[PDB]
Structure 1
Amino acid sequence: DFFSWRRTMLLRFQRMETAEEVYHEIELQAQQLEYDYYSLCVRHPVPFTRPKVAFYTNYPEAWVSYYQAKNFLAIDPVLNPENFSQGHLMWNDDLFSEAQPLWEAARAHGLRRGVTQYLMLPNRALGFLSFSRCSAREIPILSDELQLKMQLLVRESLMALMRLNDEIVMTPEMNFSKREKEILRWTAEGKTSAEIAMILSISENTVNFHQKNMQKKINAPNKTQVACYAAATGLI
């Protein structure tokens, strides 16, 4: 019964107090669905220029280390939201036609089958939950059931990890005052210091004071980086 399954899982992820409890539960759930491995990968919205990818997996260390050394991240189709439908992606051979080194390496080490579910988080990070299996044998599972179950697992695990302030999911902290945020908003709209001073009935010195403090807080070189980081993560 899905309604009861769902009821239990929300409560289990609600009550978790550590990252390892989240990872252990995902491992157990993968196992119940008859999967050998999981990986949880998060493409952060920033830096814009080389976005951070953070992960946690039970794949053997040699495989992860190999995936990293071959730069399979650049070709990995399982981490591209454009090829998901309804947040869901059952792996097939066609998926890997532009990622043949990855497909060959994976099949040579014993991987046969897998599935990925994804979600965009409130901070605009993209979370991907993959399950994989070394067995090519048909397991009977309702497509709808698997989809809905992984929908919850990817959301709750990453919501728990967000609540637990985990490095895998957290974007740079921008503890900005109300007034700083207000000035930032006018900045993002293309207003100059002079125009913002008129809008808010303050001096340019005051505007630039606030700009400077926000730059200082996050170690930014200018207001553009502050506004863009704020805009990207939804702080603004």
Structure 2
Amino acid sequence: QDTDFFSWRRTMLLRFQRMETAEEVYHEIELQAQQLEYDYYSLCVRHPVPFTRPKVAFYTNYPEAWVSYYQAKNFLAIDPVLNPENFSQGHLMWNDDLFNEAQPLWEAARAHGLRRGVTQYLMLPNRALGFLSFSRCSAREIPILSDELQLKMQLLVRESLMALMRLNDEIVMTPEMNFSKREKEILRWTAEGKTSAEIAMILSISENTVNFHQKNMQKKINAPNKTQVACYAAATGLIH
């Protein structure tokens, strides 16, 4: 069983690498969640921007009654399952003590039929945090162990979100920034604190064009000034 995991990995990588539809990824998440005796799955992504109220997108086969309930009560703001501080090796076991500061969410979950669950998370190249949760409606498997699950989940989180990025799904995709290589170079220098006057000296071009590219750079994102553009670029790693 040490070997059939390694091959499982290789099929999985190949499956996910060559998937051409978003609905195929979620399909595979669902297939695997079932093979592992979980009824419900949930794939959640926290974006790095906007800095003040960053967007959160999700996809789940949860009972819609609970989804509607979950949103209505604003449970996202207090769900420990979406807090990386609570994880270990990117893994998290649901238990009663975990919901010590969010009692309303936990019993409400019990009431809707979510008794046991597990969550895996990782960070993506666009700096967005992705969270995959599994849940079942039978009391079971409290002490998991279960190292193969963690590893199975480790992979299922990564490649699905990796597949979804290749497919430009907005659940995972950050704001589009197709900049000329020259335009991006000026940004690296803007983030270093250089004035258009100062940037002009080093790159040997007119200050008229520096100011021109900046506004053109701001066009394709529609930001007020050079500061927001640099920060969005830096927050996503486009500039490094």
TM-score with structure 1 length normalisation?
0.97
- Which residue of the other structure, out of 106, 113, 118, is the alignment partner of 2:116? 113
Q: Distance in 2 between matches of 1:195 and 1:160?
A: 42
Q: Which runs of 4+ in 1 moved over 6 A?
A: none
Quote the offset at 1:9 in angstroms. 1.1
Identity among equivalent pairs (%): 100
**What secondary structure does 2:157 align onto?**
helix
Q: Distance in 1 between matches of 2:142 and 2:31?
A: 17
Per-residue deviation, residues 60-88 of structure 1 (Å, max 9, x unmatched): 22211111111101100100111111111
Per-residue deviation, residues 82-137 of structure 1 (Å, max 9, x unmatched): 11111111111111111111112101111111111111111111100000111112
Per-residue deviation, residues 158-181 of structure 1 (Å, max 9, x unmatched): 111111111111000000001110
Per-residue deviation, residues 25-62 of structure 1 (Å, max 9, x unmatched): 10110111111111000001111111000000000222
Matches for 1:1-236 after TM superposition, within 5 Å = 1-138=4-141, 142-236=145-239
Compared CA separation, residues 120 and 12, structure 1 to 2 (3 A): same
Quote the offset at 1:15 in angstroms. 2.4
Q: Distance in 1 between matches of 2:140 and 2:80?
A: 23
Per-residue deviation, residues 162-221 of structure 1 (Å, max 9, x unmatched): 111111110000000011101101111111111111122222211111100010111111
Quote the offset at 1:142 in angstroms. 4.8
Quote the offset at 1:23 in angstroms. 0.5
Structure 2 unaligned blocks of 5 or more: none
Q: Distance in 1 between matches of 2:234 and 2:35?
A: 40
Compared CA separation, residues 139 and 99, structure 1 to 2 (3 A): closer
Q: Distance in 2 between matches of 1:229 and 1:158?
A: 21
Quote the offset at 1:138 in angstroms. 3.2
Structure 1 unaligned blocks of 5 or more: none
- Aligned residue pairs, count: 236
